[PDB]
Design a protein around this ligand. Structure first.
Ligand SMILES: CC(=O)N[C@H]1[C@H](O[C@H]2[C@@H](O)[C@@H](NC(C)=O)[C@H](O[C@H]3[C@H](O)[C@H]4N=C(N(C)C)O[C@H]4[C@@H]3CO)O[C@@H]2CO)O[C@H](CO)[C@@H](O)[C@H]1O
Length: 374
């Protein structure tokens, strides 16, 4: 009954050398659900491949779903949306019955032709960013899910969502009971809690209160516990709540290197990984290697938030390791959550270069779920 929902950022195939991660780098027995990120839409609802040369011409959709030839119990979904896809087109599509119907039919066509087992909806986000219809998106999102479910039930297909985590974000976008009603599960994106957009350093996925935070109005802080408890309290049953964890960290440039605790002033985004190549975030594979190769880094545990962080002069990095992943899965076990969702498989230490075996984060998730440790 416990599930492990693995997202694959399919553009990782274009990384070079040790960062390159293709479909055949996936271990299909370390996930119960594997999700191909991402397809997109136009405003008229037509589902479409975002990288047709890879997805279609080079057969990547079908190579991905063919992982079921190795693990016949694996479910392989396709995810529509994502951060880069924005909100406007989803807002327009969801408001019009004709566009919703077009989305249902065109997404179903892709699912069946490429042998996917269902659809994950990652609209980021109803009533936010470049939304066109504003608060109406909250209703139209639930209507879209209802209509997808009605059609998908004719084929036995899965329907899931990925959602923003903390209360102040969730209340802008979702009616929780009507979202939960139509989906097989809700993947709560319990990460990106803090990042280089903030004025101070902070953890990507702190479990509880963090160093440097006030305990007054503790329920308003951006942490995993507050988000999970919000979703449970708002009507998501535990058997439909899948708790997200990150396989990447976020990086900052300190304002003053001598002030290097969490919640210390930051000047902006920090280092980039050699393969992900974007200032402000780093894959676990990249950062564990950096730490292994450069002894000058200081790694500390925030024993309030239950997560590690590292600093070296101006660099300050929040990340998650085997120990913090263990704490996260133990938390999920303690609340009888349906399982663990991860963004994303291609930045685990998939080559085992950091000395804890291949896929240390993903193996940790599977081990702690199987053992039931709370
Ligand atoms: C297709 C594309 O736009 N590729 C971009 C790439 O965009 C990525 C990254 O910004 C991802 N960030 C990280 C830390 O991996 C980002 O991940 C988001 C994702 O959209 C959300 N959806 C989920 N689910 C669990 C459904 O989790 C979140 C994650 C984590 O926040 O996704 C976008 C694409 O939407 O960005 C790089 C440079 O950043 C660019 O080269 C190009 O590869």
């Amino acid at each position: 009954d416990k599930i492990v929902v693995c997202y694959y950022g399919t553009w990782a195939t274009y990384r070079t050398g040790l960062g390159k991660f293709d479909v055949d780098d996936i271990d299909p027995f370390l996930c119960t659900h594997l999700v191909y990120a991402f397809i997109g839409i136009n405003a008229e609802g037509t589902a479409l491949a975002l990288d047709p040369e890879l997805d279609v011409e080079r057969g990547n959709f079908k190579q991905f779903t063919s992982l079921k030839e190795k693990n016949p119990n694996l479910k392989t979904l396709v995810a529509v949306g994502g951060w880069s896809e924005g909100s406007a087109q989803y807002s327009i599509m969801a408001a019009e019955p004709e566009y919703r119907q077009n989305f249902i039919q065109t997404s179903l066509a892709m699912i069946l032709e490429y042998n996917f087992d269902g659809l994950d909806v990652d609209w980021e986000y109803p009533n936010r960013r470049d939304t066109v219809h504003g608060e109406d998106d909250i209703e139209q999102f639930s209507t879209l899910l209802k209509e997808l479910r009605e059609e998908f039930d004719n084929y036995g297909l899965l329907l899931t969502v990925a959602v923003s985590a903390v209360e102040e974000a969730a209340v802008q976008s979702y009616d929780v009971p009507s979202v939960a009603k139509y989906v097989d599960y809700i993947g709560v994106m319990t990460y990106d809690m803090h990042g280089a957009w903030d004025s101070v350093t902070g953890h990507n996925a702190p479990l509880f209160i963090s160093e440097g935070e006030s305990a007054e109005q503790e329920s308003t802080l951006y942490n995993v516990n507050n988000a999970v408890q919000y979703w449970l309290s708002a009507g998501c049953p535990p058997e439909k709540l899948v708790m997200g964890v990150p396989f990447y960290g976020r990086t900052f440039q300190l304002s003053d290197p001598s002030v290097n605790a969490p919640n210390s002033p930051s000047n902006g985004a920090g280092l980039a990984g050699p393969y992900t190549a974007e200032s402000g975030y780093v894959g676990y594979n990249e950062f564990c290697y950096i730490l292994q190769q450069e002894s000058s880094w200081t790694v500390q545990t925030d024993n309030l938030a239950k997560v590690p962080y590292a600093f070296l002069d101006y660099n300050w990095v929040s990340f998650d390791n085997v120990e913090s992943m263990t704490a996260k899965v133990e938390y999920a076990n303690s609340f009888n959550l349906r399982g663990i969702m991860l963004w994303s498989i291609e930045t685990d230490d998939f080559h085992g270069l950091c000395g804890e075996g291949t896929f240390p984060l993903l193996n940790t998730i599977n081990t702690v779920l199987a053992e039931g440790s709370t």
